[PDB]
């Protein structure tokens, strides 16, 4: 037999926010190869998933081969946009929904994860926001652009950073990109392009890095469009699902355990030689060299 | 748990010639995984293959973690060079080790596998050879060219346009290749970087094209040096392979059950969403952007 | 004044069949920065493009801007797909075009070229042809497959390889490439797509095995659709004008001498730290992510 | 003759502190070419910049091929970080180089050229900063990392936007950027690799974006090591010019008026057909698929 094995390793698992992203998708199949998983869940939205999940709101989407019930070690609430607690401005202080949580930024969390589990083995970023999205790149505003980078991008760096130090010999991380990265999409605003293009180039910058300081892998996922929270906001995700079933090698449209399958061989002992790389699960649509009306 | 399954299935590997090659070792993974399988053979190598392996001689490197030795159900000599008996040249035809064999072009192989077997679920292509790999691209005759294309990639597009029609649902396709493809890499001679350029251009192409008519899946794996036949006979491999350590994000050099260990990945129904893919599994070389002597 | 100046330098064009191709358009280009032209045309239509250009058919395309016409100092017939008299099949030795010639194959016409003019400073390729186009790559031949190979890229080594040697300081090559050389597009089939990824690779390769031998330059333009000879050819190139137009950041359609002027600037001295480039001149289709519909 | 026609166009370079970048190469060959030149200089060095200008510290790279001295119309005090007033923090406003000047924020400069000119043609980015470049990427901090994205990559959209709306018919923009925007180059600290990755995401979105909005092109150029204010302080930048040297197809030093030359080209209406590129201009390091020590 061959097996991806991840028995007794610790996954990480931040942005998981409901059932319906890829995040979810990934923590399914990381949980089907019998890894444990911890959670970071963003802290505005922290109380109603952890209480959805408590009713038993998202139960048809825990069901595991083994009869087993998808669960969660710890969930954590965190907010990626601040390493440490002297970065959280008044506003968010005193806002409601975080002024009744502490220790959730990332320097937090990651002690907290050091505490209780000692060390994790993967680490999944599955995260992203611009305020702007729906804007033009010509009238995206600075603080706008700076915020899709902060969220989307140097999160990653940030999470990397925290956790390297705890991490056990054979770890991995996994982040998640669009093609708009390194070509035009219209529609993909907010600076969200760039914060996938930087996202993608630190992928490669830190593979090298912590490849030599720690033997850490570091691999990306380019996927297909999803109906997620993030895809539905955009207000077009099923036109763009309608679209690449039109245009790519292969019909069916994508489901969140594609690409939570992909992360499994990813960050299993079977893929000790694949670090840096780009890996499309998009039905192959990001190979093509023109739109479906000239087929 | 989450395994990669596929016991039940029939296997097609093109260019296994002995146990030191990604060939081999993408048939042991495959065979851990459960699948049946077929071998193409060349002709000229055919008869000292199949007796050494039933002498025991590669008994070291059969072992399989079942306990199981690797096993081939047939062994095909073959030359992918030829489509039809009509293509062989006179000078093949009075050789010695081709003259008294027959049904080894690959047509006739096709046929035999039909009747014998009916169908195919993989399809992997480990096949390369150029008469001129010591000559500068500047001083590569015509003859040379061609001959590397014709060996190592319209030989692919030969297999895949025969088996298609054979098989089975779910069915996928590897092919392996190298970074020289699409980056200059001096001493990569004899037209061999046209004909890996060709392959990966022919892997998107024909990802589309067999995606569409068949549902079959088409990938390339780009893997880091290994001192197999054909690496050993360039005549710096281990200086190659040294290189690849000091440059790579990671160190380990590579072992053949790597890039099987992707293989089995991308054949197996985990990966349904992945086609017209290159995977890079190398440590990492292909990601940077300097070599070593300025990190 | 800032010019791109050719003045004295012999350029030598493989690819001029009439006035409408990208071959007609660089000659017109390095013909107003004042380089001498010598044209290599295809053996089939050599006579009768020599007989339309002695009728005055070409004159309202030959006007150049200083009041002069467009003139070829030399035409040779030729045929790139021979290097020698010897790899000419009788077949092709007794059709009525090459039997009334003589003198065509690579060779020859480079030893006719030295003899007359001592030396050359420019090479342009701008040829192209596959007997299979039409088809799916799926369903094309070996031998068509190959002699696609041959005649659009393997053409290049030979007239770099034989022309190299008789190439002044300062020398540079152009040649012409798709963007469906390695992104997938159905309907450039016969392994058109193969043969323009080996024509991209050839041109990495070949600048830095040329740039060491003969410090000569090597670059690639890869253009947007054009209604030449071989564009209308395929039958829909006015369709494929048109999706262009809606496709691209700049709707304008292209013309000639757009790539013309690129190819006087690349082989000028001002581009004299230009080398293995492929350069876009297709109004910016090829950076786009996805195609019209989803504007 | 063939010429880079300037004549009467209005040019904006962003990013020129002293003669030895290059800013001033770009300025040199954009007046060779007949542009009337205004230059954007950073408030720090403005003061230095301007008194060494009229002093005549730099006369010896001023002098043109027409044998008239480069000279700028207007030089604006700037700091490409501010978009409004509103944008600018306390210990700017009150810092001793800034609290004497006035209208220096991106607006209030497009603003001023307003008044004075009218109209623009030609906007010439080269400018890039990192407070961290010495750093790690796994050690760059948030706001070192941002800083970078907002000095390097967001300043060029502010720029763009700001100046789209008064740019004539024909217009164009230039950036520059390195290869470590997409492949790892250990040392390119501080976030620069992801600035990088985004000033080109952008130029392909925001040529589709300006390119529709207002006809505009917009290009990049990515240019080998340099000597320069920006190049020496990074501390070992005489051992990449070494290490390009060995590892190039041709061996040439990067001399700033050669980025000029193709910058010219690139801003001419010889180049129409031109936009979304990223223009190689390295001496074709960026092709090589190894690094010197191999060969
Ligand atoms: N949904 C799609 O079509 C595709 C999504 N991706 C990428 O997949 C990843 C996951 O997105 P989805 O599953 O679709 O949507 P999602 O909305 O379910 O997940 C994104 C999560 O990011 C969290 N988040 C936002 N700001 C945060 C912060 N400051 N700190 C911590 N968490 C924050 C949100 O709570 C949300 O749960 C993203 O990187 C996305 O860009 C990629 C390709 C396609
Ligand atoms: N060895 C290395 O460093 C690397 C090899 N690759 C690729 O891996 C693939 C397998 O190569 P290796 O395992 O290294 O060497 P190998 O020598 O073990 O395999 C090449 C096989 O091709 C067969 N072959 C040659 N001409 C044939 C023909 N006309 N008809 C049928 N079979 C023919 C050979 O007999 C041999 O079995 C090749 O495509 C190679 O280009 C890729 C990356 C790295
Ligand atoms: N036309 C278009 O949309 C585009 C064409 N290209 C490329 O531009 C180049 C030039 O093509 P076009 O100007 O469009 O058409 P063209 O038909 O005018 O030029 C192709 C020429 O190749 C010559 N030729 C064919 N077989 C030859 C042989 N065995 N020996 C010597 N010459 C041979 C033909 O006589 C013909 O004149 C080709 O490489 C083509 O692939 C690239 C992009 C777009
Ligand atoms: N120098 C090299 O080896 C190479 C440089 N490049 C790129 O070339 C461009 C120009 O760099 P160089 O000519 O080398 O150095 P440079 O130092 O001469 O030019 C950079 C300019 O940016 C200005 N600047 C910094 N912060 C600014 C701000 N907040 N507002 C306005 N201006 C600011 C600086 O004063 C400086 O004049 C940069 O984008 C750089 O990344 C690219 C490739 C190679
Ligand atoms: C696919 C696809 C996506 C999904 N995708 C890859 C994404 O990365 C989505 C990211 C995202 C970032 N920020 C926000 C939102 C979504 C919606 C709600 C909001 O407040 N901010 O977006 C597109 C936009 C245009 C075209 C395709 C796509
Ligand atoms: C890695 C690597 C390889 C291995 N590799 C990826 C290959 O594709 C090897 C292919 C090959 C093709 N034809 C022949 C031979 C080897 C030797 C025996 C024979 O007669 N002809 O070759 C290199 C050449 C230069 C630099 C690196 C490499
Ligand atoms: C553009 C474009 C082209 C033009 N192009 C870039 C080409 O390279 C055309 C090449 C070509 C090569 N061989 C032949 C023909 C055309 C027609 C006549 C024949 O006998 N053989 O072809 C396409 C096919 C599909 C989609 C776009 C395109
Ligand atoms: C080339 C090359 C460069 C030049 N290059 C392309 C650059 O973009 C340099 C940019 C730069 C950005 N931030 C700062 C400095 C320079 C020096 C002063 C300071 O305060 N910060 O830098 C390298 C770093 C490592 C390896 C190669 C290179």
Known sequence: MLKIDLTGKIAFIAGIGDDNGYGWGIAKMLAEAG??????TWVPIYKIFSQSLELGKFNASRELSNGELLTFAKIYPMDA??????????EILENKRYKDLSGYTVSEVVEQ???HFGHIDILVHSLANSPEIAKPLLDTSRKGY????????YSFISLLSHFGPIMNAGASTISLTYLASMRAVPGYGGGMNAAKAALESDTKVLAWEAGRRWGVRVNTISAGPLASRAGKAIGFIERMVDYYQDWAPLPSPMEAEQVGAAAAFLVSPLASAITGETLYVDHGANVMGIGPEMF
């Open 35 to 40: 890894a444990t998983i911890l959670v970071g």
């Open 81 to 90: 946009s601040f390493d440490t607690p002297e970065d959280i401005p008044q």
């Open 113 to 115: 994860v050091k505490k």
């Open 146 to 153: 700076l915020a899709a980078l902060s969220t989307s991008s």
